[PDB]
């Protein structure tokens, strides 16, 4: 294999960290290849669930246990920190607040969250390199509680980062911003692509095509598939009562993605930054809520 940058892998990773008993798993958990029965049952449909009052409920309350989470690695972020630390963290917060942590086994991912380091697209492993001054890094939380999902992420400054830095990661979390602000019913799903691009490409910077958005509830990832970029062909139409994400990827040099052969670090061609912010929203008759909203606080950790 051809690293596409400087970052490496940094092996052997900790032996998988348990998740007690009394916590409620979902299907992949215990399937030995993390193979999820109900996310395939349903793959390939473009149908989209209405969530009743209850399933609200569930996801509210699963979308503020995830922020809550996020914000627990968000204060570890610093010079020295593995982020296989930050991940023992998050997967005992997951724990204290009676949440499975839904990457563990995922497809037989063997972490508890995401951790994406400047080339690092999404899905990067979280491993036994100290995170280095300059460095960005992105946190990706998905928590399971009582049959629902919930999922957020953003991109962190590890102490002083360089202007090219600041920008990429501010120009994202606008993108993301900007979408969220156009969703409410009777808007088509494929138009926050454009959105998110248009600005993207303002600042210099390009949009990953291979990864998208998507639904969210009693499954970790069903539809709708929702691209980042223009012109894109996604299918469907904002509802009252539809919940999903929008988790836009931006890069600083081209679009073009790869896989490590971990089978899931997947890293820009080019050996260029990418950073990603995420939410899970509720499509109400207004607007949406922002189901994993920050509520100390007004802004993203990256702006303090
Ligand atoms: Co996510
Ligand atoms: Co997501
Ligand atoms: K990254």
Same mark, same amino acid.
């Given at each position: ?5 400087? @970052? ?42 209405? @969530? ?38 998050? $997967? ?24 994406? !380091? ?39 400054? !590890? ?12 120009? *994202? ?18 138009? @926050? ?5 248009? $600005? ?16 969210? $509830? ?46 899931? *670090?997947?890293? *820009? ?16 008759? *207004?607007?949406?809520?922002? @189901? ?8 993203? $950790?990256?702006?303090?």
């Amino acid at each position: 294999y051809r690293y596409t940058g400087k @970052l490496r892998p940094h092996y052997p990773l900790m032996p998988t960290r348990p998740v007690p008993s009394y916590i409620q798993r979902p299907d992949y958990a215990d399937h030995p290849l993390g193979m999820s029965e109900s996310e395939q049952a349903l793959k390939g449909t473009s149908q989209i669930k209405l @969530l009743s009052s209850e399933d609200i409920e569930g996801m509210r309350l699963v979308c503020r246990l995830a922020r809550e989470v996020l914000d627990v690695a968000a204060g570890m972020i610093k010079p020295g920190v593995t982020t296989e630390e930050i991940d023992h963290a998050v $997967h005992l917060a997951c724990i204290a607040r009676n949440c499975y942590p839904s990457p563990l086994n995922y497809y037989n991912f063997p972490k508890s969250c995401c951790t994406s !380091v400047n080339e690092v697209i999404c899905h990067g492993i979280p491993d036994r390199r100290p995170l280095q001054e300059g460095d960005i890094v992105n946190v990706d939380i998905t928590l399971y509680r009582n049959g629902y999902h919930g999922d957020l992420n953003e991109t962190f400054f !590890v102490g002083e980062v360089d202007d090219g830095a600041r920008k990429l990661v501010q120009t *994202t979390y606008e993108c993301l911003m900007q979408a969220i602000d156009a969703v409410k019913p009777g808007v088509r799903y494929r138009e @926050l692509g454009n959105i998110i691009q248009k $600005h993207a490409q303002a600042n210099g910077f390009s949009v990953v095509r291979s990864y998208c958005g998507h639904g969210i $509830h009693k499954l970790m990832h069903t539809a709708p598939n929702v691209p980042h970029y223009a012109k894109n062909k996604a299918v469907g139409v904002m509802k009252s009562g539809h919940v999903f994400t929008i988790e836009p990827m931006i890069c600083e040099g081209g679009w073009q993605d790869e896989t490590w052969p971990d089978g899931w *670090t997947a890293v *820009t061609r080019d050996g260029k930054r990418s950073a990603q912010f995420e939410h899970t929203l509720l499509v109400t008759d *207004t607007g949406c809520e922002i @189901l994993t909203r920050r509520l100390d606080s007004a802004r993203p $950790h990256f702006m303090s």
